[PDB]
Amino acid sequence: VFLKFVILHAEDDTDEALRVQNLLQDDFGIKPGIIFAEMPCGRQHLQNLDDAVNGSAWTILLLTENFLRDTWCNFQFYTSLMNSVNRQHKYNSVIPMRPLNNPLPRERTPFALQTINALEEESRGFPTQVERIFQESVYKTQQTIWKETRNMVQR
Amino acid sequence: VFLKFVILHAEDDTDEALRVQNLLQDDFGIKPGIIFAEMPCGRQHLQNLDDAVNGSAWTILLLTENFLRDTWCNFQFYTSLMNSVNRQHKYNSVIPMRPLNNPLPRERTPFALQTINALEEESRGFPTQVERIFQESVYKTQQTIWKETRNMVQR
Amino acid sequence: VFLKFVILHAEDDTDEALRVQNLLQDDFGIKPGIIFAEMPCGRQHLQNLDDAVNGSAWTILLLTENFLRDTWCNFQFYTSLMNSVNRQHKYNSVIPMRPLNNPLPRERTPFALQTINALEEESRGFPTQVERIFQESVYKTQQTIWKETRNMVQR
Amino acid sequence: VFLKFVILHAEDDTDEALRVQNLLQDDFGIKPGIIFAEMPCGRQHLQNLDDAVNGSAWTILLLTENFLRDTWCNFQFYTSLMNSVNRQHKYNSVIPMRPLNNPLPRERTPFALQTINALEEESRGFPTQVERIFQESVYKTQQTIWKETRNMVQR
Amino acid sequence: VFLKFVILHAEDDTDEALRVQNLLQDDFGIKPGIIFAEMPCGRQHLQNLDDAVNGSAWTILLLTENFLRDTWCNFQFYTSLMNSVNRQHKYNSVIPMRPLNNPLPRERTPFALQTINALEEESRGFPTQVERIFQESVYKTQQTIWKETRNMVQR
Numbered sequence: 202v203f204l205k206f207v208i209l210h211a212e213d214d215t216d217e218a219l220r221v222q223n224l225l226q227d228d229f230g231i232k233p234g235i236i237f238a239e240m241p242c243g244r245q246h247l248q249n250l251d252d253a254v255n256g257s258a259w260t261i262l263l264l265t266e267n268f269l270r271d272t273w274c275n276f277q278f279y280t281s282l283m284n285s286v287n288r289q290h291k292y293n294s295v296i297p298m299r300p301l302n303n304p305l306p307r308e309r310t311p312f313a314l315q316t317i318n319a320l321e322e323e324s325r326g327f328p329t330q331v332e333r334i335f336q337e338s339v340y341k342t343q344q345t346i347w348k349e350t351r352n353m354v355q356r
Numbered sequence: 357v358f359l360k361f362v363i364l365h366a367e368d369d370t371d372e373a374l375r376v377q378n379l380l381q382d383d384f385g386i387k388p389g390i391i392f393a394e395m396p397c398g399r400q401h402l403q404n405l406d407d408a409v410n411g412s413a414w415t416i417l418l419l420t421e422n423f424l425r426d427t428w429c430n431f432q433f434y435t436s437l438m439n440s441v442n443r444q445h446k447y448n449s450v451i452p453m454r455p456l457n458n459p460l461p462r463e464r465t466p467f468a469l470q471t472i473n474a475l476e477e478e479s480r481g482f483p484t485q486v487e488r489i490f491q492e493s494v495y496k497t498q499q500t501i502w503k504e505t506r507n508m509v510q511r
Numbered sequence: 512v513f514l515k516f517v518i519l520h521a522e523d524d525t526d527e528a529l530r531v532q533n534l535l536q537d538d539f540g541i542k543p544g545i546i547f548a549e550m551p552c553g554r555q556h557l558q559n560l561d562d563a564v565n566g567s568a569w570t571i572l573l574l575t576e577n578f579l580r581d582t583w584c585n586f587q588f589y590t591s592l593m594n595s596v597n598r599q600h601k602y603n604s605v606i607p608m609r610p611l612n613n614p615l616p617r618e619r620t621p622f623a624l625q626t627i628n629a630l631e632e633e634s635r636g637f638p639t640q641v642e643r644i645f646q647e648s649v650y651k652t653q654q655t656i657w658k659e660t661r662n663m664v665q666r
Numbered sequence: 667v668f669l670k671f672v673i674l675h676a677e678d679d680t681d682e683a684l685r686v687q688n689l690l691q692d693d694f695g696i697k698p699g700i701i702f703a704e705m706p707c708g709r710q711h712l713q714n715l716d717d718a719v720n721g722s723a724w725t726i727l728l729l730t731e732n733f734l735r736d737t738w739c740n741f742q743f744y745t746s747l748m749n750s751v752n753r754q755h756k757y758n759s760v761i762p763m764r765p766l767n768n769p770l771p772r773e774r775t776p777f778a779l780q781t782i783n784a785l786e787e788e789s790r791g792f793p794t795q796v797e798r799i800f801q802e803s804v805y806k807t808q809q810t811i812w813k814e815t816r817n818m819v820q821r
Numbered sequence: 822v823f824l825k826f827v828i829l830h831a832e833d834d835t836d837e838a839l840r841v842q843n844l845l846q847d848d849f850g851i852k853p854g855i856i857f858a859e860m861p862c863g864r865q866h867l868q869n870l871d872d873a874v875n876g877s878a879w880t881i882l883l884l885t886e887n888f889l890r891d892t893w894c895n896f897q898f899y900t901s902l903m904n905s906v907n908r909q910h911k912y913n914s915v916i917p918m919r920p921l922n923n924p925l926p927r928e929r930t931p932f933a934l935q936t937i938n939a940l941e942e943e944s945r946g947f948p949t950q951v952e953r954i955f956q957e958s959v960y961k962t963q964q965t966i967w968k969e970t971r972n973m974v975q976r
Contacts, residue, residue, distance in 0.1 A: 409622075434626050438625050438626055
């Protein structure tokens with residue numbers, strides 16, 4: 202399995218993540234895709250995070266007003282940022298998007314996100330920019346590598 | 357005999373274990389499966405535990421609010437954890453699941469369980485994640501080995 | 512009589528038990544202490560086991576390579592494990608220690624022991640950890656109770 | 667007892683841990699401090715881990731080239747990470763430090779560690795940064811709480 | 822602690838940063854001051870960046886020929902630029918200075934820096950312009966605020 206998109210969320214906002222997940226899968230037909238919670242039960246969350254980073258092309262940060270309020274949440278996506286930096290194959294995989302439900306405002310955004318275009322479903326821009334960018338060839342390039350990039354790990 | 361699932365329970369909660377056992381067997385058709393109490397009478401509980409660990413693919417921890425309250429109960433599943441660690445054939449066989457009847461809360465969970473996805477029949481997630489995971493091939497792989505893994509013990 | 516330590520051994524290894532017994536008594540001055548064989552002649556072994564469990568603070572499992580090879584040997588220390596679980600006064604009295612002479616290896620250890628720190632005279636650790644733990648107050652606490660715990664049985 | 671530092675190590679590297687332990691204790695006078703192996707014999711390793719987490723101010727990860735190669739080793743420090751996240755009293759207690767003996771290289775570091783400053787005795791930086799940080803008041807603050815934080819557990 | 826100056830550098834050029842740091846501290850007596858590497862060990866680099874931005878009056882960009890060659894380096898000082906824009910208290914705190922060791926040439930400078938006076942230790946100008954500008958009152962103004970600006974954060 203390899204995902205077109207993965208949503209990172211706080212459990213308080215899983216309905217929003219789902220809603221987004223639905224919107225992503227349903228409207229765009231962008232499937233398969235996983236939210237952090239679904240990852241195989243009975244395993245370590247950390248290990249699933251690492252595997253999840255590998256298994257997803259793009260990495261959606263559900264920028265909910267209190268997404269930052271829980272410390273470990275800050276820790277989790279930090280590693281994702283590095284992974285985008287580390288591997289060309291994941292370059293810009295980390296997609297900050299303000300939710301509809303209580304988006305994080307610009308007043309206090311962490312500067313790191315301020316340096317990046319943070320999207321929003323409220324905006325006219327989001328769907329056209331996704332359409333223009335999140336396309337077969339862009340995904341095809343990523344997955345084609347991924348599979349062989351993990352065959353090495355299974356030989 | 358080899359089990360798809362084995363439930364570990366405290367005698368105070370055997371009705372819940374049964375109910376779960378029924379739900380598992382009845383709804384999913386996941387049969388055969390045993391709860392700790394049923395193991396052959398007249399034998400040592402410890403020895404049955406060891407054999408039970410071998411005889412079951414997955415190992416359900418009935419995380420009842422007072423499941424931890426009895427010390428030996430803590431001892432019992434500790435060994436199961438090791439067995440998951442020890443043998444690939446039992447990797448993640450230990451499935452922490454909060455019951456419906458007075459589940460153990462997150463306030464005081466033993467950190468070890470906190471590191472793991474603990475399931476719950478209250479959740480929307482549990483049945484779909486089981487369906488996606490607890491499937492013929494996954495069980496087939498485990499049992500196929502088990503039988504020969506014990507023929508060695510009976511030659 | 513109440514013992515600081517009791518050694519459980521197979522007759523094939525009594526020299527090792529003795530050697531250990533000597534080392535324990537001689538080096539540490541930890542006296543008195545008994546090995547399973549010495550228990551009063553002409554009595555039932557089982558009954559001596561029960562009394563021996565009561566009469567000893569700590570309970571050394573001479574983990575010789577074939578200590579497990581004789582079935583009843585497995586049965587004997589099983590009851591000791593329960594007694595540690597049953598009585599606070601005997602909590603952790605059961606001390607698995609790999610001998611010098613052909614210690615049981617980690618390859619096949621019974622998982623129950625794997626969950627526990629099993630000591631070894633080969634290690635640098637064993638003597639310092641004993642010194643730090645097996646001390647007057649720890650023993651004093653146990654014996655002080657024991658005596659009155661059996662006066663009840665003799666009134 | 668409460669420790670200024672605790673070293674987490676794989677048994678293959680205990681000499682390095684010791685050497686580090688010596689260097690820490692001897693050069694800086696930072697005493698007392700324990701390595702994972704020393705924890706009271708005859709007890710469960712897991713339980714000692716939990717108590718060890720409580721008993722130490724700082725938590726040194728002996729990042730030896732094969733420290734990650736053993737799975738349970740990965741599991742162990744995962745819980746420590748959470749404990750740093752969970753309790754302010756342990757904030758940043760988890761100190762990743764590359765050993766002298768075959769340090770883990772940056773080529774394959776687990777991203778989580780990549781997000782953190784990992785120290786190294788090879789560097790000019792390590793001793794001055796410790797001196798500037800690991801100081802009476804910082805330790806005093808931690809221990810002063812710890813003692814009362816466990817008096818609650820012993821009342 | 823509050824710094825007169827902070828140097829931002831790539832690890833390949835730490836000797837230059839040090840040399841500059843020495844020159845700054847030694848020649849001008851401008852102390853204390855920190856280079857990016859020194860920030861407290863065991864913490865997140867990003868968080869230290871944010872705190873470092875607050876803790877320094879002026880922010881030296883070690884414009885080494887390959888300072889831009891590493892992408893995240895570009896990201897880091899971008900946030901600093903904003904902070905100068907955001908807060909009057911940090912207005913022009915960001916001081917681009919070409920090093921002695923392989924300075925970035927004007928041929929390919931990023932236009933943003935081209936709009937700004939970029940200093941150079943090779944020039945006659947640098948020391949007199951620093952003397953005329955980096956003076957007690959200018960620093961006094963900044964620190965006096967800083968301290969109370971963080972008392973708000975610690976009340």
